[PDB]
Coordinates of C-alpha atoms in Angstrom, one line a residue:
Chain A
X4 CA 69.4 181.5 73.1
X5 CA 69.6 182.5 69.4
X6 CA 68.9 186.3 68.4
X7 CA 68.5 187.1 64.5
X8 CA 70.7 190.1 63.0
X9 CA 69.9 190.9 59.9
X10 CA 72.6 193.0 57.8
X11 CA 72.3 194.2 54.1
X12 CA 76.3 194.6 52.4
X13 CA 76.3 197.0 49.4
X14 CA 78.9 197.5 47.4
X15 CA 78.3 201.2 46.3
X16 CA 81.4 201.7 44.1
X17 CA 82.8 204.5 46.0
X18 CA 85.8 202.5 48.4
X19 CA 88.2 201.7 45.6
X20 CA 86.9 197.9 46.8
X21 CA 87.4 194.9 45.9
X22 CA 91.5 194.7 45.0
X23 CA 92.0 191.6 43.2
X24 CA 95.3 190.0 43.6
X25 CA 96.0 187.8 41.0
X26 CA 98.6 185.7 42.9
X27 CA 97.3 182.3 41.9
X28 CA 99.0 182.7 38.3
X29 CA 97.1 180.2 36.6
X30 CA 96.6 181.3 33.3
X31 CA 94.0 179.5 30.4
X32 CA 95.9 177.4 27.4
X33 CA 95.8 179.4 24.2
X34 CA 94.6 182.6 25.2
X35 CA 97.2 182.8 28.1
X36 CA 94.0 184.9 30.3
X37 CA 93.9 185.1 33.8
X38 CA 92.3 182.0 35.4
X39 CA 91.0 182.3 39.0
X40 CA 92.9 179.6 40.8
X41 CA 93.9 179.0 44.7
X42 CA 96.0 181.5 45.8
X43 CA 94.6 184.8 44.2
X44 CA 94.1 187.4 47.2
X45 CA 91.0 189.7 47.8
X46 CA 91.0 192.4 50.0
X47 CA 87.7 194.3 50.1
X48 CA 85.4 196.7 52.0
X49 CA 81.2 197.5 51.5
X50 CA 79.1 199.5 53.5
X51 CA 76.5 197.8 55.8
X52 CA 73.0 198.8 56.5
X53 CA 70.4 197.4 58.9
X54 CA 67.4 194.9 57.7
X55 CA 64.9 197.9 56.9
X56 CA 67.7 199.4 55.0
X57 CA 66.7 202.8 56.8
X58 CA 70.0 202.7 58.4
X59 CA 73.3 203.0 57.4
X60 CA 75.7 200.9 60.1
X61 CA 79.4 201.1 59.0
X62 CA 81.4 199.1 56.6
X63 CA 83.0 195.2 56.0
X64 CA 86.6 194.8 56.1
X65 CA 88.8 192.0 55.0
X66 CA 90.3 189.3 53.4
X67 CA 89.4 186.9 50.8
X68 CA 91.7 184.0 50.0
X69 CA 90.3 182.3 46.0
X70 CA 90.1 178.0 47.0
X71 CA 89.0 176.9 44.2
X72 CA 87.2 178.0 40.6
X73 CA 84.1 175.9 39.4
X74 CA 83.6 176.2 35.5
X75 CA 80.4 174.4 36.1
X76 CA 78.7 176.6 38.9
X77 CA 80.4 179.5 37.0
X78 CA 82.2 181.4 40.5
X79 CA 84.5 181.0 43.1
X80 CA 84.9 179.1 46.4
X81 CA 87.0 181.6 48.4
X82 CA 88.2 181.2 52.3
X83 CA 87.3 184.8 53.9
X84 CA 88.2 186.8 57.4
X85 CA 86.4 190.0 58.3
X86 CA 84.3 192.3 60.4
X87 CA 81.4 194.2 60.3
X88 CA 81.7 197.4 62.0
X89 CA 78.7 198.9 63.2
X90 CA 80.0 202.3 64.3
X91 CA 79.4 202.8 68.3
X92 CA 77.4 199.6 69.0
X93 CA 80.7 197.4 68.1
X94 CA 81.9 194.8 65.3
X95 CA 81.3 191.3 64.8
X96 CA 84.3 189.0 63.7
X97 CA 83.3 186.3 60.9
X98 CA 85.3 183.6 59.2
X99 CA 84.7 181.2 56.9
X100 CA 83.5 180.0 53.4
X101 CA 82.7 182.8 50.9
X102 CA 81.0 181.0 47.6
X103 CA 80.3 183.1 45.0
X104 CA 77.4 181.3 43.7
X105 CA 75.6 180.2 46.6
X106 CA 74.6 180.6 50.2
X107 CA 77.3 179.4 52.7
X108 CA 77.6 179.6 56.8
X109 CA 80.9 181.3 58.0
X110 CA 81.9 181.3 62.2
X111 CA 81.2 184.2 64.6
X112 CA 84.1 184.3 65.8
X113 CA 83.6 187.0 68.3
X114 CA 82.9 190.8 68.5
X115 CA 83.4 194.1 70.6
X116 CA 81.0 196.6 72.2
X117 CA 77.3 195.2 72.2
X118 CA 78.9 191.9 70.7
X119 CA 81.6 191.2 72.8
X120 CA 81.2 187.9 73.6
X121 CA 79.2 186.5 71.0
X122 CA 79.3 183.4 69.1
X123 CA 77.5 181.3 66.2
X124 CA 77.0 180.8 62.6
X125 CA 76.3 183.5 60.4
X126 CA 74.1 183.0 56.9
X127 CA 75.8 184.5 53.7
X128 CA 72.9 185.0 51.4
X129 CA 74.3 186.4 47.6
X130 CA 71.3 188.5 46.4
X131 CA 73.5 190.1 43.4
X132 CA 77.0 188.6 43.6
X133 CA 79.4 191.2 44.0
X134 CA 77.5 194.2 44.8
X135 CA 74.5 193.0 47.3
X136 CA 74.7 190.5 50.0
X137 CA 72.7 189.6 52.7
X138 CA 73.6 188.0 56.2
X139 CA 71.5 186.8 59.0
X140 CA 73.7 186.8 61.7
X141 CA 72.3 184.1 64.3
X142 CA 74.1 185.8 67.8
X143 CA 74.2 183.9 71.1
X144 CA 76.3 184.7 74.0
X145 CA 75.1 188.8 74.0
X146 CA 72.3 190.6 75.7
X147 CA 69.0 191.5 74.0
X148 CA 70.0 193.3 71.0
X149 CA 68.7 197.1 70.7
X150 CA 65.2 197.5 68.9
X151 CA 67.0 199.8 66.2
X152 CA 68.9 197.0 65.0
X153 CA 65.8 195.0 64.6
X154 CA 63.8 196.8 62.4
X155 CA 60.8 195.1 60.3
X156 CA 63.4 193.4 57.5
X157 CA 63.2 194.1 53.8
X158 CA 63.2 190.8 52.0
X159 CA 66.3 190.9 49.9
X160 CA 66.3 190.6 45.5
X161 CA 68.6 192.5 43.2
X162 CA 66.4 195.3 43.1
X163 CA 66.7 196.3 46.9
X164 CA 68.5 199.7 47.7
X165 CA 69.7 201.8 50.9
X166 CA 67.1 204.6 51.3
X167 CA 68.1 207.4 50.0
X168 CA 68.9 209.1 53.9
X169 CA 70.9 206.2 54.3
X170 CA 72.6 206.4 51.6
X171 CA 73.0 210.5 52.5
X172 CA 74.0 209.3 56.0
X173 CA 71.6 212.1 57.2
X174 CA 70.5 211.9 60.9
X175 CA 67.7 209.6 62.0
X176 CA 69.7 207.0 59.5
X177 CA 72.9 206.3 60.3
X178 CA 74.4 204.2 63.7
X179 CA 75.4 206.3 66.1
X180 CA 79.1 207.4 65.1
X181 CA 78.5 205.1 62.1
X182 CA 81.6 203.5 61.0
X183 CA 83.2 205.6 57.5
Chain B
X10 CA 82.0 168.7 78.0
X11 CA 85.0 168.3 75.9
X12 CA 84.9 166.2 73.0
X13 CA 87.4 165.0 71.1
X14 CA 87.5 164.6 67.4
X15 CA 90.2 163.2 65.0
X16 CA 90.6 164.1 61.1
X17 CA 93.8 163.5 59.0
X18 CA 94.6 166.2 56.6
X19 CA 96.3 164.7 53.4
X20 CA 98.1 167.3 50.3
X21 CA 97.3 164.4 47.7
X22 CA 98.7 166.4 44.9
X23 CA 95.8 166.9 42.8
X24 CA 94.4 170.7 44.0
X25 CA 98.5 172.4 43.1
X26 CA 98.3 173.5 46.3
X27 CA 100.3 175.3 48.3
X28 CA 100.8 178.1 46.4
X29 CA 104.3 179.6 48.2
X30 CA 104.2 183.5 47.4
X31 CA 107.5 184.5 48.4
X32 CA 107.0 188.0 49.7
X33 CA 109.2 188.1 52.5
X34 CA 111.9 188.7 49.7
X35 CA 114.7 187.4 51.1
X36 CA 117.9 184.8 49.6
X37 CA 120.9 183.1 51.2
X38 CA 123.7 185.2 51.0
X39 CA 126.4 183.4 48.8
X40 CA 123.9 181.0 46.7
X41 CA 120.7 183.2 46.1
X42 CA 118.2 180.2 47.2
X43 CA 115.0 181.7 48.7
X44 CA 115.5 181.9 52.5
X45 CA 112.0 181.5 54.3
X46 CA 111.0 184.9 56.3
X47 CA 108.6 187.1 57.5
X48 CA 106.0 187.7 55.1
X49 CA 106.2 185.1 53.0
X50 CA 102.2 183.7 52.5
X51 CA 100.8 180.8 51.5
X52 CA 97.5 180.1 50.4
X53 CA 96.6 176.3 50.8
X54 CA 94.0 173.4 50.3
X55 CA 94.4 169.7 51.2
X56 CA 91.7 166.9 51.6
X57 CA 90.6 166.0 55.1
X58 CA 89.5 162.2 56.0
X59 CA 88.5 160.8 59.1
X60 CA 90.0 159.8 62.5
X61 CA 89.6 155.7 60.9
X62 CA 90.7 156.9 57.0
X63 CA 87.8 155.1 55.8
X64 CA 85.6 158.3 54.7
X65 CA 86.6 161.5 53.0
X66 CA 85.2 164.0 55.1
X67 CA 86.2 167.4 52.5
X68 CA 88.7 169.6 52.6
X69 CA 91.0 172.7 54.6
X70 CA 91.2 175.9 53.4
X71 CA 93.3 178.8 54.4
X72 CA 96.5 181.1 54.4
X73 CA 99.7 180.8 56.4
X74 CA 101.5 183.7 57.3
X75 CA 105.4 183.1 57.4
X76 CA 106.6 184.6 60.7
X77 CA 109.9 183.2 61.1
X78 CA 112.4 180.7 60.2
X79 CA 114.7 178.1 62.3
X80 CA 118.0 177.5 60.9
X81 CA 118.9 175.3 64.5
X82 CA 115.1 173.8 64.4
X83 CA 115.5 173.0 60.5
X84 CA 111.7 174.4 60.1
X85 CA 109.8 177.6 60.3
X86 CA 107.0 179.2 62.5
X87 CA 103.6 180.1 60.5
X88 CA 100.6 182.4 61.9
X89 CA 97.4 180.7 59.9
X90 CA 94.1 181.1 59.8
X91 CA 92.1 178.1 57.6
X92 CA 89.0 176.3 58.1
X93 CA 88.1 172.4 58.2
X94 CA 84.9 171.3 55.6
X95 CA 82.9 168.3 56.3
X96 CA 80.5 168.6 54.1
X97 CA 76.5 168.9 55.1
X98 CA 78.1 168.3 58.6
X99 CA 79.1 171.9 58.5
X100 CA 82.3 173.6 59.5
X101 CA 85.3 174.2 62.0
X102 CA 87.6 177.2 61.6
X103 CA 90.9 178.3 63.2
X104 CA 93.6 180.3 64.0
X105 CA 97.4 180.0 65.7
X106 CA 100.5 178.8 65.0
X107 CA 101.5 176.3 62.2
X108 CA 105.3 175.1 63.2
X109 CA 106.8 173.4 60.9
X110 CA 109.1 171.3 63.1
X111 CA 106.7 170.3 66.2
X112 CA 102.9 169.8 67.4
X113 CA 101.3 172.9 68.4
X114 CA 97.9 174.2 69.7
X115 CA 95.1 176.2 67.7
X116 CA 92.3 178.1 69.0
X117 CA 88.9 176.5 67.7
X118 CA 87.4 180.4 66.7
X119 CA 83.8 178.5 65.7
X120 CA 81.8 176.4 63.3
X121 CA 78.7 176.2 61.3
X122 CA 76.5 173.3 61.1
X123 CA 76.7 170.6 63.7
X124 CA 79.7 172.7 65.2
X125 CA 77.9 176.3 65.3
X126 CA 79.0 177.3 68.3
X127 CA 81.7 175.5 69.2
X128 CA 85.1 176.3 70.9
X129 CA 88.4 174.7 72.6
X130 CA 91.9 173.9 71.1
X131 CA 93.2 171.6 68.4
X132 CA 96.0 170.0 68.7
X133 CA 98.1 169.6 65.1
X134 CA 100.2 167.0 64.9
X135 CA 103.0 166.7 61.8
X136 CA 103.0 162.9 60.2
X137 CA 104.9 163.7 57.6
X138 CA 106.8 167.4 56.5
X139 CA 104.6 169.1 54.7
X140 CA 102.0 166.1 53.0
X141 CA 100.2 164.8 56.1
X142 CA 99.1 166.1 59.4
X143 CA 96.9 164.5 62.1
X144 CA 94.3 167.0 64.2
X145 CA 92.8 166.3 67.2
X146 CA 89.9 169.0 68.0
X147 CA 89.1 169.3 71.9
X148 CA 85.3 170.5 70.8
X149 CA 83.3 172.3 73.4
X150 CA 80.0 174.0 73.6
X151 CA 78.2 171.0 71.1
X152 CA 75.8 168.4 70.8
X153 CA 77.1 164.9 70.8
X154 CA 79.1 164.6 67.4
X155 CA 77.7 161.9 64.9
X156 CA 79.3 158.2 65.8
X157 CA 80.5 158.8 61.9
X158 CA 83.0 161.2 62.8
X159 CA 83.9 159.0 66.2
X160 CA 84.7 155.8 64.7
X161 CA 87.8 153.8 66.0
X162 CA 91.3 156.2 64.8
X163 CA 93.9 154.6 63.1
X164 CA 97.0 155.3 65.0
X165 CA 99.2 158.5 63.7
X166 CA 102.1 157.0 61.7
X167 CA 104.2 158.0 58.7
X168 CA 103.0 155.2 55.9
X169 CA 98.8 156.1 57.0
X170 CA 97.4 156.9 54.2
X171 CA 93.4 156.9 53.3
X172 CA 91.5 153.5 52.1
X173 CA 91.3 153.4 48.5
X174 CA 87.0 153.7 48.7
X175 CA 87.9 157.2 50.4
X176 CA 90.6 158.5 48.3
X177 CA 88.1 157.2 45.1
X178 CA 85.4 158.9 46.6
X179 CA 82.9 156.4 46.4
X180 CA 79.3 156.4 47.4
X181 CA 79.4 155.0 51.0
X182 CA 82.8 156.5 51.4
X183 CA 82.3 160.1 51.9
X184 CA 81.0 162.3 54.0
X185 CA 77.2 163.6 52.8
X186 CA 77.8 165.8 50.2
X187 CA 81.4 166.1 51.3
X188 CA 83.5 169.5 50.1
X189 CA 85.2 169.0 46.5
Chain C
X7 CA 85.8 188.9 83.6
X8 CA 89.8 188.8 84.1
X9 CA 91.9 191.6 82.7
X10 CA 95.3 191.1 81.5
X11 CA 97.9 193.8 80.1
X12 CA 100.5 193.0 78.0
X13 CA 103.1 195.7 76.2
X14 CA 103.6 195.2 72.5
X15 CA 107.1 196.5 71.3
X16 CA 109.0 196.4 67.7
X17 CA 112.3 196.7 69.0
X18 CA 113.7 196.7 65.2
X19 CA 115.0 193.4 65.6
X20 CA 112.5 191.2 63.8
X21 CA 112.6 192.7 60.1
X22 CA 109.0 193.2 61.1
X23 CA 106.7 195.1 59.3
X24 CA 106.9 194.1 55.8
X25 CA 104.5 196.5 54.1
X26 CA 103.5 194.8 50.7
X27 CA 102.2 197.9 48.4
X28 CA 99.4 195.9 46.6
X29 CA 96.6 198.4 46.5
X30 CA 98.8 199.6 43.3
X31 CA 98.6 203.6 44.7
X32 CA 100.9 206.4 44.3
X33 CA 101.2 210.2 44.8
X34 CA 105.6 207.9 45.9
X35 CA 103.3 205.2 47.9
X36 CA 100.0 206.1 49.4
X37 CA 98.9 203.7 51.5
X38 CA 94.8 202.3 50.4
X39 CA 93.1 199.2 50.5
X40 CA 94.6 195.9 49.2
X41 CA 98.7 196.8 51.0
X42 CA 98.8 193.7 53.3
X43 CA 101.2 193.9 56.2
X44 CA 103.2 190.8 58.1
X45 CA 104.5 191.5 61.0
X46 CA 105.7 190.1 64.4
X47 CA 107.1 192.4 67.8
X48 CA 108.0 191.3 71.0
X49 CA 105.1 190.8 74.2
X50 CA 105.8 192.2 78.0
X51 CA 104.2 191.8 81.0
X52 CA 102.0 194.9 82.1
X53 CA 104.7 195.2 84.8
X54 CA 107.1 195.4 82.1
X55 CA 109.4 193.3 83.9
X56 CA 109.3 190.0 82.0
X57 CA 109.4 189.3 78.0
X58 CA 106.5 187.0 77.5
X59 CA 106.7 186.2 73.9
X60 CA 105.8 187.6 70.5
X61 CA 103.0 188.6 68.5
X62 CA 102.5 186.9 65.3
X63 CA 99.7 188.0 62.1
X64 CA 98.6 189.7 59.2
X65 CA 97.2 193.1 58.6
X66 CA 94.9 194.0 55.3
X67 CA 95.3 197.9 55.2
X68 CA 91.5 199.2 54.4
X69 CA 91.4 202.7 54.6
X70 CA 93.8 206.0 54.7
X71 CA 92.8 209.6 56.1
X72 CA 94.7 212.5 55.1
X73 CA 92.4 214.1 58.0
X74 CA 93.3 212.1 61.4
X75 CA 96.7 211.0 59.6
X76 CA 96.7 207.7 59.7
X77 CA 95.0 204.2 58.7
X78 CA 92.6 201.5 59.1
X79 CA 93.5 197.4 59.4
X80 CA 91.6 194.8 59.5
X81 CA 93.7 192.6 61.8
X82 CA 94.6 189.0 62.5
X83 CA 96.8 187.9 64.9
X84 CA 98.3 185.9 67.9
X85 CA 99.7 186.9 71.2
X86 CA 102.4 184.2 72.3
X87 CA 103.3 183.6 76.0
X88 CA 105.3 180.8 75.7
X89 CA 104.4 178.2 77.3
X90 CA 101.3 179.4 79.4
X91 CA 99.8 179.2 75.3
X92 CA 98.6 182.0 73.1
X93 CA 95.2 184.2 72.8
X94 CA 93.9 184.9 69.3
X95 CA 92.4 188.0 67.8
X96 CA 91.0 189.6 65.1
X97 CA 89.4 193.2 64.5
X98 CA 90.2 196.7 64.0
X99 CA 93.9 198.3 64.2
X100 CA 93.5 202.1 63.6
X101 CA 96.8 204.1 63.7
X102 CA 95.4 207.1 65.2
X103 CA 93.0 206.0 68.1
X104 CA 92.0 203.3 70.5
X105 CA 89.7 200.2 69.4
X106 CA 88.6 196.7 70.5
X107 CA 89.2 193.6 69.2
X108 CA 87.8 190.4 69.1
X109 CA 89.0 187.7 71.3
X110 CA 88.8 184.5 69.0
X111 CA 90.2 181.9 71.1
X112 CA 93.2 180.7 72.4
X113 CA 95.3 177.5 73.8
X114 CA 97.0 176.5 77.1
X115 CA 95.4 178.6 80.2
X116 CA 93.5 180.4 77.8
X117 CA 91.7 177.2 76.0
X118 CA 88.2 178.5 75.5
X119 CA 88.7 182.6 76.0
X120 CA 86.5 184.6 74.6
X121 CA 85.7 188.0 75.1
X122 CA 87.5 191.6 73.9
X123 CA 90.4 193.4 73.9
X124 CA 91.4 197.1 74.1
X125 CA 94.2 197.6 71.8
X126 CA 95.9 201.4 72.8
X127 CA 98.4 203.1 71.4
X128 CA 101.6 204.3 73.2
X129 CA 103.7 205.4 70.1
X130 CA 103.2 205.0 66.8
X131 CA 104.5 203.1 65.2
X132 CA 107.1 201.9 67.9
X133 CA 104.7 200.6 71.1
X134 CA 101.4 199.3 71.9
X135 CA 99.4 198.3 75.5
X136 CA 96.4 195.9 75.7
X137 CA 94.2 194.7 78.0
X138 CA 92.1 191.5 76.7
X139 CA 88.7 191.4 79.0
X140 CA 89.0 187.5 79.1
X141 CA 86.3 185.4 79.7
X142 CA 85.4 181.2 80.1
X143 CA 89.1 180.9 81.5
X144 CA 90.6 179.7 85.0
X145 CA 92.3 182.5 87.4
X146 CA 95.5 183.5 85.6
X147 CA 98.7 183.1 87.1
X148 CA 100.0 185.4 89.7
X149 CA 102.9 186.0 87.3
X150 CA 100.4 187.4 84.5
X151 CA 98.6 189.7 87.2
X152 CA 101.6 192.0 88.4
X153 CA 100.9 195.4 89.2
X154 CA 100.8 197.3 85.7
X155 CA 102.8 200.6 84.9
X156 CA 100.8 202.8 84.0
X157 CA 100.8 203.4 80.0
X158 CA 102.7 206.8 79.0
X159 CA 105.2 207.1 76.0
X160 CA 108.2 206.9 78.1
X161 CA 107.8 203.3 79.6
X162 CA 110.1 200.2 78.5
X163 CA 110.6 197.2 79.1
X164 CA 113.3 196.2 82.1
X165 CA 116.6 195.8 81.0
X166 CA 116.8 192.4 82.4
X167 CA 113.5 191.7 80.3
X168 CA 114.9 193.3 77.2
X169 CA 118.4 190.9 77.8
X170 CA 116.2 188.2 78.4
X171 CA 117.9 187.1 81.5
X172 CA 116.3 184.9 84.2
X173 CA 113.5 185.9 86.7
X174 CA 112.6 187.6 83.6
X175 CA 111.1 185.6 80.9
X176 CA 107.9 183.6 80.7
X177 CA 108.4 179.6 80.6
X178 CA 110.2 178.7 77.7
X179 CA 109.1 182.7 76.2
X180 CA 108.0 182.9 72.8
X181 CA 111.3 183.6 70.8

């Protein structure tokens, strides 16, 4: 069956993240400014936290490839691979659509450790586009999922923050050997 | 079990896609003309119709690794990772080898939407260097696609092309809500 | 659960890496988050007495440490075994210890893995030795299941593997 991860993403300003790539070379008439355009390259990497945001997990890490810009919707459709790494439990391998302005579904596409094996759909939710993003991972394929990673879940809006032992890393907050 | 689905993947023209980044550095000795190799990348986006060309379905989306490059085979071997959208029908992503010069096999890595979950092979088939490609996906682990996506496939040739309703995008013509 | 080994060598003759420097830093480079690295090296048999094929992908460097010496990837890439197919991955590559990655797919006898895979490293930067945990697959071939030397930083491939010569290569081996 179906087993519900949820995962907060943070960017906390402290990885050197994201590195935009400004490959696409599309440039706006007149001014000569940088337009986003296919072809402009994204590597990044945030810290993850559980759902109660009690717990720090580990980190994202990947690669986001700009599709398409959308003048209208004001943001970016980008093509993205990466992993959540959630220190000795495992990682879990996503790929998939990466819209700046709205909710998308990106492929499980496996995982290690407690999530070897897994499959599914995963739902990108953009609380604060870049710096707060929520994902509910929906898992099949693993065993029952350990009752720390399924905390009571705060609901997410731009004002939601690590606690501040999570943030600290202090013990009784972070995964066990929580990925840095 | 497996089930097979058919999508032609047209570069109409219109999206200035690919965008060849010509990392891999390297020129022919004696002329200075770039000389595929590893390292080159190549972001990309084409439009995707289905197996019968009478509905536009949405769009790939992806990067291509350059790997290495055939001077007997007159083509060049690609690592790439992209995904297939079909609009509200969701998503299939993948990953394997892109060669230039003959049909090759990707691994299905998942799917959202009607395909969460799914997994298998695809086989790519080149119509015509580099403008049109044919896919067959062998699609486990799903429900039974929509008769939509199963209608009768025109056969592979190099003069296919998409009807006029599809390629205008009309209503009736297009997938639901089918990905611009 | 069926393991398979394979040895992953850069013999030097691919022009493989190609370390792109786009994370911008310097000290002289210092690697950091954003250098993206192509690369391609040549697949053995855990026996190490036939050349399989190649691997084939993309690495986004995420992380150095001046403390353990070394780096984080994010990985993506393919294992090719000529005509037996290829297995797909993606996950962690981490210069100075072990990690697991995830099995993404694959094609050929391996249509439909899934599972993990222990990447280990022999010598950096030189050799590596896997051993994919594959699952929702049919028995391997005999020929993928030989006895396995043991990993130590010493081993190679067979001369006659290294040649390429007959008896020694997979079906039509990934070149």
């Amino acid at each position: 069956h179906v087993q519900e991860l949820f995962v907060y993403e943070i960017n906390e300003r402290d990885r050197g993240s994201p590195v935009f790539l400004p490959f696409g070379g599309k440039k706006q008439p007149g001014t000569d400014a940088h337009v986003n355009s296919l072809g402009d390259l994204v590597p990044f990497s945030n810290k993850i936290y559980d759902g109660s945001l009690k717990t720090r997990l580990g980190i994202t890490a990947g690669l986001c490839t700009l599709i398409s810009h959308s003048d209208q919707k004001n943001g970016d459709r980008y093509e993205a691979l990466y992993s959540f790494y959630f220190g000795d439990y495992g990682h879990i391998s996503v790929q998939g659509p990466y819209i700046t302005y709205e909710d998308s579904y990106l492929a499980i596409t496996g995982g290690s450790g407690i999530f070897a094996g897994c499959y599914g759909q995963a739902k990108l939710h953009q609380i604060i586009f870049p710096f707060k993003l929520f994902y509910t991972f929906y898992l099949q394929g693993i065993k029952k999922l350990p009752e720390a990673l399924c905390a009571p879940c705060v609901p997410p809006s731009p004002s939601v923050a690590p606690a501040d032992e999570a943030k600290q890393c202090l013990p009784n907050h972070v995964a066990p050997n929580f990925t840095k």
